[PDB]
Amino acid sequence: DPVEDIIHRAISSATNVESAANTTPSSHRLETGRVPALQAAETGATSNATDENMIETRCVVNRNGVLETTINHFFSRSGLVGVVNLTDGTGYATWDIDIMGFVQLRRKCEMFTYMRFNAEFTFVTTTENGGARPYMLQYMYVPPGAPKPTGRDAFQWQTATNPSVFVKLTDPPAQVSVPFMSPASAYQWFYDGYPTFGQHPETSNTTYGLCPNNMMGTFAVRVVSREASQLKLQTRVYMKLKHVRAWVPRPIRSQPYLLKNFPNYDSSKITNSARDRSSIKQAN
Amino acid sequence: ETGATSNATDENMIETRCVVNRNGVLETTINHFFSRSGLVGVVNLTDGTGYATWDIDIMGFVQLRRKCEMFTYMRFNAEFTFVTTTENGGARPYM
Amino acid sequence: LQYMYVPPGAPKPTGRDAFQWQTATNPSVFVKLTDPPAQVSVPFMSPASA
Amino acid sequence: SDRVAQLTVGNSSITTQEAANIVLAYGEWPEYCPDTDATAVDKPTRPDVSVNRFYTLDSKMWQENSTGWYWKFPDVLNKTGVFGQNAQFHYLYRSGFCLHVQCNASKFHQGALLVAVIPEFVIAGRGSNTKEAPHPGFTTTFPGTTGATFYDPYVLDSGVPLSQALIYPHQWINLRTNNCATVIVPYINAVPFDSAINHSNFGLIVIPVSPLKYSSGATTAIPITITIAPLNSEFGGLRQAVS
Amino acid sequence: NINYYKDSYAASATRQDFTQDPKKFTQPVLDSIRELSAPLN
Amino acid sequence: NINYYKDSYAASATRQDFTQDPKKFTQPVLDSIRELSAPLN
Amino acid sequence: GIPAELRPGTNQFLTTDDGTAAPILPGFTPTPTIHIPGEVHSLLELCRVETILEVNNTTEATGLTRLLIPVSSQNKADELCAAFMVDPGRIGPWQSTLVGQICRYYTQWSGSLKVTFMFTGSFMATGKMLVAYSPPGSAQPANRETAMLGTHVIWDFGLQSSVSLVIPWISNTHFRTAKTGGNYDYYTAGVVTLWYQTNYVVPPETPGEAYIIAMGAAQDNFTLKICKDTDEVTQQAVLQ
Amino acid sequence: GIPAELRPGTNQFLTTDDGTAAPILPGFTPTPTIHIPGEVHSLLELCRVETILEVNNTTEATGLTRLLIPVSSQNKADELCAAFMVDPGRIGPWQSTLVGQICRYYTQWSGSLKVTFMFTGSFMATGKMLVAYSPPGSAQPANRETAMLGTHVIWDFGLQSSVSLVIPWISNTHFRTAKTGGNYDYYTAGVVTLWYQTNYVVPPETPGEAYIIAMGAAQDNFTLKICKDTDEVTQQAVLQ
Amino acid sequence: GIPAELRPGTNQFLTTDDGTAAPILPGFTPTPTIHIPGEVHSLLELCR
Amino acid sequence: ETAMLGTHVIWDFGLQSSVSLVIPWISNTHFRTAKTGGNYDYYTAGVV
Ligand SMILES: CCCCCCCCCCCCC/C=C/[C@H](O)[C@H](N)CO
Ligand SMILES: CCCCCCCCCCCCC/C=C/[C@H](O)[C@H](N)CO
């Protein structure tokens, strides 16, 4: 009775798969019209020709494990993400928490665009000659907006609101757990965009690709003492990705790395993906 | 002038949509706000009168004082921790 | 000290402070000399059945 | 019954007689934002006819020595039509797309294109500096309707090889088999609504892998036209115009 | 399956996932193709 | 939810509070006002 | 005994940690509780109470004059009265509120806000005002035909001497990091420019310079995520 | 207290270990999840997607020419077109695939493989090709009468422009260590020599030089055992 | 935490001792067993 | 780029050698007077 036109699913299906797939026995095909070997790669789909329809196979009850290949068992292996150098005699050292600076764990994380995980940090602090001297350290976590410490014995080390860890050099290394601290719903490693409005330049726009949903703060460290002790330190920070979910896979890096935040490469030296051989007509 | 705040909700000012909100109001309570240990006193001991005292008054350091001056009456338990070092960093086996 | 385990095919370390010691995928154990000795368990890692 | 198709969206329709198939990106359809995932508290606008229709861009001539091309979405439609006016008055934005790349050639021509869709496609600079450093200009990152030619298509101008770029949603335009590629893409972002001016979600890319070859006497001018269309688009946060 | 804190992110790794769904990456097409037929007809 | 001493103050933090009552600070008036009416009449 | 093996994190002192500790006084029974009025249970009871903004924070006022916004009879139409950003946790008028001082202990606020304007002129003075919130994507609106496009409330002076503009929650992300000014203008939220709708009309023998006291609080869906230390404090000694 | 006694492995830090750790922020509730399309659950979703091999990895191509295999009209019969080893985890054409780059993070692969050839010539050009896999025990076959004895698929050019040779899993051991080239040729798997079945026949006024794009993926029974670090990466600084 | 007190025999390494140890590879599933003839179960099969 | 904004049909040459653009009835009035060219351009209908 009123205006009528105001009144007016998916494809994939997940299966719990425990072991690898089996193989059923086959026979020989002598008939026309039914062909499993001819494909069309232009349709954007991969080939679906199974090996029972190409050759004659046997019955194999397959008992291999598909457990270690999941994204939880692949990323729950802690690797180095930052090295903080402290020379005492300004007395302290800070570290902007950015794990895109070391290349063993970066390339594993660049397989995907969006990742949602918890972390588990570990701080292995030594001296420059090996370590083990009984001095006491303090590790603050400074969130974005909190005042960073400006002295060896400044008042920001009172630490009444934000977390901190007291541990000696001669103890086992300190280890905490860190939740999902981003304001978005996933850490994105590739942000094709600009953070602010305005006229963006042509020569050197250092803001392209800056994602402020990933900047998580500052990690500060000092030696808990009054008089300046004279000993050079290094901490090493190891991040273990746990409870991890990943979205939108992308190809893996093939060019050698350059800057932390920007995916630069040089165009004058492009390394080939496959190392060369003599000719195409021989295999070795 | 009535001493009350405004009660105008945003559904009565503009046209809104249906939002099922799932944000956490847990970390803002007064237990999770004050259960974070901060510095309240520094006791200096130079041996050679041989001892040192400290009148227990936490109104001397300003990080934890200003959090406690939001309220007039407070009733709590405490949990002290004593981090003792030397003047050059610490770790000498004395009792 | 640091004890890495390098599987067959993984790059062996070529320096005292090389980049293979970042250890983002394969296992490693950090332990001092003055701790009790480190101890792990290792499964059946052969491609055959014995 | 599979090579013939028609795609009617809005007041526009595309016919084809030599198609291959239609690809849904990641197996999902573009839809509106549900109430359990929305974070704004205003009511969105949904024009649904005036903004969901096939917009035809300009044509790119394909030659012997073409190194390839890339557009940013929704960058190319911020200045065309009523979608270009709703994406300037409104701060927030959400949509899907439906892409269609036409390229015909005769029975005596040969070659192949790779039409893929890359979410969050970040352009790299081309210098051997370790900090200053070179960064791409604004007309290179956000090119507009005229697109931009690749400098190094082997690494997709991002240090990432083309040989693995079939993990993205894609089709092929093989000139002996088909003449058109169709990819339907949902909304892929870490936030439910995001700005349509700062942030372009994905980038369409057409790269000729095997080159165009033809014997003498054939038609030398082979153009590539691209016709795109928003689907299930909705806006929010009304204000004055910012381009 | 144990936790000593009330915070759910301080726990160890959770239960195993055991699932995969390759049909959204391998065959993301509308007209579903069979194996024993020609994909273009 | 564990304690190793008989003294109740040696325990950890207790159960969560989950309640708030803002009507004693926001609207502490006798004549209760509605929203859709004029507050002075 | 039970064969145990130690893990990393042994012998450390995490400040925010939640563990037991040995009591000093066994058998202790404290002083009994009495009823004391006005108990808080969370800090979102305190962020809903309207407190005064310092909109007139220029270098000329220097005192209690800083709290109030002047109005008068204008010769031209279309004119502007005041303007301020909407950012709890930014330098400016919000810094003198309970919302703007509790959102400095916390990172990543979320939710709507509200701004209440009270008019402190005489009874015989009449007028109308336009109060407009404009979401980000541009600079402060230059005239009334631009600021009328955003969210706005037209306010008539009368017996009910107070209006309230409810600033909605329009955002792309669920949370805004509450630290802004540099490259963090990705998290800004907008302006509340005040415009003359008609005029400030006044009879003879009545003062032609009136004031407006502006207030600010948060709505019912306001939250705060990550607790940090505030930057409003300095110290250089022990307070002997 | 409880009488405990410590064991070896005390105070160590195993990187792959699975234990709890003390949280820094109590009472934390993160930002809620939304629906983002295309979630992976394991890496065997990524090893089934066909990506392009670089069969023409000579020292002459230098670019995007490296991906494609040339065909033309031959004067003699029986001739060879291309050849490559079957070893995910060996230097050569497999190194530019998702299979050949995820099988470098893992030791000891297992299962079948598949190679899809797409022909990018003109419509009027016809021909037939022989695609032969030969199990190990010898060198690359020298003529077509030797390579016809192994597993092979005869492919006719036509409207369906793609064939797929499914390389079966023929092995003595359950797993192949994915590092080979020296004394580890105990774990090699074979060659995929391409032979002309008849010819590349072409009408007049049609180009007589066509190309083939070769693709590669893994079957449904493909697994990977021991996780290690990849050798494709170098670093000599901190990336300032 | 739980108030514990240590005993003698702390931090030693007895070779014949029977205790657990932390695994290096989580989620590991080995190569499946086949039937190989002639399995021993004790050394008194060999002394006869 | 201007004519693509109106009603349009993209036509591919092939075995089906004919397309048909259906010009819809878009008008303010119910009828158009069928005499036009001067001041009667109030009743015009468009271009193909
Ligand atoms: C006393 C404890 C101090 C250490 C606590 C560190 C907590 C902050 C960690 C936040 C989560 C990881 C940081 C973000 C990951 C990547 O680096 C960024 N997304 C960079 O793009
Ligand atoms: C061996 C243990 C020695 C340390 C034991 C200290 C117990 C005394 C603590 C009493 C409770 C806190 C003291 C009172 C808090 C504020 O400083 C005062 N109200 C100051 O106004």
Gap from CA of B34 to ligand 2 centroid (Å) = 16
Query: Are G224 and B27 a contacting pair, CB within 8 Å?
Result: yes
First vs last C-alpha separation in chain F: 55
What is the gyration radius of the CA atoms in chain E, in angstroms? 21
I3 CB near a chain H CB, below 8 Å?
yes
Question: In chain H, which residue's Cα lies nearest the Cα of G9?
Answer: H21
Map residue A234 onto helix, strand or coil. strand
* Mutate which: A152, A180, A224, A230, vs B, most B CBs within 10 A: A224
**Closest Cα in chain B, distance from residue G68 (Å):** 16
A243 CB near a chain E CB, below 8 Å?
yes
Give every CB contact of residue H141 below 8 A, 6+ residues apart in sequence.
H132, H134, H147, H150, H191, H193
The number of residues making up chain G comes to 240
What amino acid is encoded at C39 in this protein?
Q
Determine the Cα angle at H44 with ends H43 and H48, to 5°.
Answer: 125
Q: Which 31-50 residues of chain C touch chain H by CB within 8 A?
A: 31-32, 35-40, 45, 47-49
Q: Annotate C15-45 with b (16+ C-beta within 10 A) or e (fewer).
A: eeeebbebbbbbbbbbbbeebbebbbeeeeb
Structure tokens belonging to residue G7? 């893990």
Could H41 and E20 be called an inter-chain contact, meaning their C-beta atoms sit closer than 8 Å?
A: yes
Query: Are D159 and A254 a contacting pair, CB within 8 Å?
Result: yes
Give every CB contact of residue A98 below 8 A, 6+ residues apart in sequence.
A82, A215, A260, A261
Determine the Cα angle at H231 with ends H226 and H232, to 5°.
Answer: 125
Question: In chain D, which residue's Cα lies nearest the Cα of A252?
Answer: D160
- Among D65, D54, D45, D152, smallest CA distance to D102 is for D54
State how far the alpha carbon of G102 is from the alpha carbons of D206, G47, G53, in Å: 52, 8, 14
Residue whose structure tokens are 């509070």: F17
Query: Are A160 and A180 a contacting pair, CB within 8 Å?
Result: no
Chain Cα centroid distance, residue D88: 20
Q: Which residues of H touch D216 (CB under 8 A)?
A: 205
Q: Is G21 in the pocket of ligand 2 (CB under 6 A)?
A: no
Q: For the purposes of burial, counting CB atoms within 10 Å of the CB of A66, is it exposed (0-12), middle (13-18) or buried (19 or more)?
A: buried
B36 CB near a chain A CB, below 8 Å?
yes
> What ranges make up the beta strands (E) of chain A?
15-16, 38-39, 79-87, 92-96, 112-118, 121-127, 136-142, 164-168, 174-177, 187-188, 218-223, 232-239, 242-249
State how far the alpha carbon of B53 is from the alpha carbons of B39, B56, G23, in Å: 17, 9, 21
What amino acid is encoded at D107 in this protein?
K
What amino acid is encoded at G181 in this protein?
G
Gap from CA of A97 to ligand 1 centroid (Å) = 5
After which residues does chain D break, using C–N > 2.5 Å? 131
What amino acid is encoded at H175 in this protein?
F
Phi first, then psi, for residue D141 (nearest 5°) are -80, -45
Residue owning the nearest CA to atom 10 of ligand 2: B56
Q: For residues G200 and G155, what is the distance between their CA atoms, to the nearest angstrom?
A: 13
Give every CB contact of residue G236 below 8 A, 6+ residues apart in sequence.
A155
State how far the alpha carbon of G181 is from the alpha carbons of A199, G175, G190, I29, in Å: 17, 17, 13, 53
Map residue D22 onto helix, strand or coil. strand
What amino acid is encoded at D27 in this protein?
G
State how far the alpha carbon of D58 is from the alpha carbons of A192, D67, D146, J2, in Å: 24, 18, 7, 11
Determine the Cα angle at D133 with ends D129 and D134, to 5°.
Answer: 110
Map residue D202 onto helix, strand or coil. strand
Those chains having 3 or more beta-carbon pairs within 8 angstroms of chain B are: A, D, F, G, H
Q: For residues G79 and A241, what is the distance between their CA atoms, to the nearest angstrom?
A: 56
Query: Are A211 and A113 a contacting pair, CB within 8 Å?
Result: no
Phi first, then psi, for residue A239 (nearest 5°) are -105, 130
Map residue D123 onto helix, strand or coil. coil
> What ranges make up the beta strands (E) of B39-91?
none
Q: For residues H120 and H22, what is the distance between their CA atoms, to the nearest angstrom?
A: 59
Q: Which ligand is nearest to the CA of A191?
A: 1
Structure tokens belonging to residue C9? 């095919």
Q: For the purposes of burial, counting CB atoms within 10 Å of the CB of G37, is it exposed (0-12), middle (13-18) or buried (19 or more)?
A: exposed
Structure tokens belonging to residue H155? 């492919």
C-alpha torsion sign, points A47, A52, A54, A58: positive
Could B92 and A134 be called an inter-chain contact, meaning their C-beta atoms sit closer than 8 Å?
A: yes
Determine the Cα angle at G33 with ends G32 and G35, to 5°.
Answer: 145
**Closest Cα in chain H, distance from residue C13 (Å):** 11
Q: For residues G224 and H25, what is the distance between their CA atoms, to the nearest angstrom?
A: 13
Q: What region does G203 belong to: left with phi over 0, alpha with psi -120 to 50, or beta?
A: beta
Chain Cα centroid distance, residue H146: 25
Q: What is the experimental method? A: cryo-EM
3-state DSSP: chain D helix, strand, coil percent, rounded to 5? Answer: 10, 40, 55
Phi first, then psi, for residue G156 (nearest 5°) are -100, 130
Phi first, then psi, for residue G6 (nearest 5°) are -85, 160
H or E element that contains A71: helix A71-75
Could H11 and C32 be called an inter-chain contact, meaning their C-beta atoms sit closer than 8 Å?
A: yes
Strands I4-6 and H106-110: what pairing? unpaired
Q: For the purposes of burial, counting CB atoms within 10 Å of the CB of I30, is it exposed (0-12), middle (13-18) or buried (19 or more)?
A: middle
Q: What region does D84 belong to: left with phi over 0, alpha with psi -120 to 50, or beta?
A: alpha
Structure tokens belonging to residue A216? 């998580």
Structure tokens belonging to residue D19? 């198609």
Q: For residues A74 and A111, what is the distance between their CA atoms, to the nearest angstrom?
A: 12
Domain G1-240 has CATH 3.40.50.80: no
Q: For residues A267 and D157, what is the distance between their CA atoms, to the nearest angstrom?
A: 9
D226 CB near a chain H CB, below 8 Å?
no
Q: Is B57 in the pocket of ligand 2 (CB under 6 A)?
A: yes
Q: For the purposes of burial, counting CB atoms within 10 Å of the CB of C48, is it exposed (0-12), middle (13-18) or buried (19 or more)?
A: exposed
Reading across the β-sheet that carries D69-70, which strands appear in turn?
D69-70, D202-214, D109-119, D170-174
J21 CB near a chain D CB, below 8 Å?
no
Torsion, Cα of H90, H94, H95, H97 (10° steps)? -150
Query: Are C41 and C15 a contacting pair, CB within 8 Å?
Result: no
- Among D224, D210, D209, smallest CA distance to D105 is for D224
Give every CB contact of residue A204 below 8 A, 6+ residues apart in sequence.
D132, D133, D134, D135
Query: What secondary structure, in 3-state letters, does chain G show?
Result: CEEECCCCCCCCEECCCCCCCCCCCCCCCCCCCCCCCCCCCEHHHCCCCCEECCCCCCCCCCCHHHHEEEEECCCCCCCEEECCECCCCCCCHHHHCHHHHHCCCEEEEECCEEEEEEECCCCCCEEEEEEEEECCCCCCCCCHHHHCCCEEEEEECCCCCEEEEEECCCCCCCCECCCCCCCCHHHCCCECCEEEEEEEECCCCCCCEEEEEEEEEECCCCEEEEECCCCCCCCCCCCC
Gap from CA of A160 to ligand 2 centroid (Å) = 17
Query: Are D170 and D114 a contacting pair, CB within 8 Å?
Result: yes
Strands A38-39 and H162-167: what pairing? antiparallel
Q: For residues G155 and H214, what is the distance between their CA atoms, to the nearest angstrom?
A: 71
C-alpha torsion sign, points A269, A271, A276, A281: negative
Question: Residue H4 half-sphere exposure, CB side, CA atoms within 13 Å?
Answer: 13
D238 CB near a chain B CB, below 8 Å?
no
E20 CB near a chain D CB, below 8 Å?
no
C-alpha torsion sign, points H61, H64, H67, H68: negative
Longest dimension (CA), chain B: 76
Gap from CA of A181 to ligand 1 centroid (Å) = 8
H18 CB near a chain I CB, below 8 Å?
yes
Question: In chain C, which residue's Cα lies nearest the Cα of H180?
Answer: C9
Q: For residues G143 and A226, what is the distance between their CA atoms, to the nearest angstrom?
A: 59
Q: For residues A155 and A222, what is the distance between their CA atoms, to the nearest angstrom?
A: 13
Question: Residue H32 half-sphere exposure, CB side, CA atoms within 13 Å?
Answer: 17
Structure tokens belonging to residue G60? 């000329």
Nearest to F13 among B4, B7, B31 (CB): B31
Give every CB contact of residue G240 below 8 A, 6+ residues apart in sequence.
none
Give every CB contact of residue G19 below 8 A, 6+ residues apart in sequence.
F12, I1
> Alpha helix locations (H) across chain B?
30-34, 62-68
Nearest to I3 among H1, H14, H225 (CB): H1
Q: Does the N-terminal peptide bond of residue G37 adopt cis geometry, omega within 30 degrees of 0?
A: no
Give every CB contact of residue B58 below 8 A, 6+ residues apart in sequence.
B40, B41, B64, B65, B68
Q: For residues G189 and G113, what is the distance between their CA atoms, to the nearest angstrom?
A: 11
Question: Residue A144 half-sphere exposure, CB side, CA atoms within 13 Å?
Answer: 26
Q: For residues G227 and B64, what is the distance between their CA atoms, to the nearest angstrom?
A: 14
**Among 1.10.4080.10, 3.90.700.10, 3.20.20.80, 2.60.120.20, what is the CATH number of D1-243?**
2.60.120.20
* DSSP assigned state of H173: S
* Mutate which: E14, E36, E37, E40, vs A, most A CBs within 10 A: E36
Residue whose structure tokens are 């394909």: D62
**Closest Cα in chain E, distance from residue D3 (Å):** 7
Q: Which 43-62 residues of chain A touch chain D by CB within 8 A?
A: 43-45
The domain limits of chain A are 1-284
Q: Compute how many other C-beta atoms are within 10 angstroms of the C-beta atom of residue B12.
A: 11
- Among A65, A67, A57, smallest CA distance to A24 is for A57
Give me the residues paired with residue G224 across strands.
G109
**Closest Cα in chain F, distance from residue G105 (Å):** 20
CATH, range A1-284: 2.60.120.20
Gap from CA of E13 to ligand 2 centroid (Å) = 41
Gap from CA of A239 to ligand 1 centroid (Å) = 9
Question: In chain D, which residue's Cα lies nearest the Cα of G110?
Answer: D39
Give every CB contact of residue A122 below 8 A, 6+ residues apart in sequence.
A78, A173, A174, A175, A237, A238, A240, G8, H13
Q: Is G25 in the pocket of ligand 2 (CB under 6 A)?
A: no
Query: Are H150 and H133 a contacting pair, CB within 8 Å?
Result: yes
Q: For residues G232 and G87, what is the distance between their CA atoms, to the nearest angstrom?
A: 16
Which residues have C-beta atoms less than 6 Å from ligand 1?
Answer: A 97-100, 119, 121, 139, 141, 163-165, 176, 178, 181, 187, 214, 216-217, 219; H 24
The number of residues making up chain F comes to 41
State how far the alpha carbon of D151 is from the alpha carbons of D62, D158, D212, in Å: 16, 11, 18
Residue whose structure tokens are 């048909």: J20
Atom of ligand 1 nearest to the CA of A140: 1
Q: For the purposes of burial, counting CB atoms within 10 Å of the CB of G24, is it exposed (0-12), middle (13-18) or buried (19 or more)?
A: exposed
Chain Cα centroid distance, residue H206: 34
Longest dimension (CA), chain J: 45
Question: Residue A5 half-sphere exposure, CB side, CA atoms within 13 Å?
Answer: 2
Strands A242-249 and A112-118: what pairing? antiparallel
Determine the Cα angle at H142 with ends H138 and H147, to 5°.
Answer: 70
Nearest to H52 among D28, D131, D166 (CB): D166
* Mutate which: E25, E35, E41, vs A, most A CBs within 10 A: E35
Residue owning the nearest CA to atom 19 of ligand 1: A214
- Among D212, D66, D63, smallest CA distance to D148 is for D66
C-alpha torsion sign, points A104, A107, A112, A114: positive
- Among H120, H122, H118, smallest CA distance to H206 is for H122
Query: Are H84 and H53 a contacting pair, CB within 8 Å?
Result: yes
With the most atoms of ligand 1 within 8 angstroms of its CB, the residue from A75, A81, A94, A99 to mutate is A99
Map residue J37 onto helix, strand or coil. coil
Query: Are D31 and D186 a contacting pair, CB within 8 Å?
Result: yes
Query: Are A54 and H219 a contacting pair, CB within 8 Å?
Result: no
Q: For residues D34 and D156, what is the distance between their CA atoms, to the nearest angstrom?
A: 35
Query: Are C28 and C5 a contacting pair, CB within 8 Å?
Result: yes
Q: Which residues of G touch F5 (CB under 8 A)?
A: 20, 22-23
H or E element that contains H151: strand H151-156
Q: For residues D5 and D98, what is the distance between their CA atoms, to the nearest angstrom?
A: 14
Q: For residues A87 and D65, what is the distance between their CA atoms, to the nearest angstrom?
A: 57
Q: For residues G100 and G94, what is the distance between their CA atoms, to the nearest angstrom?
A: 5
Gap from CA of H30 to ligand 1 centroid (Å) = 14
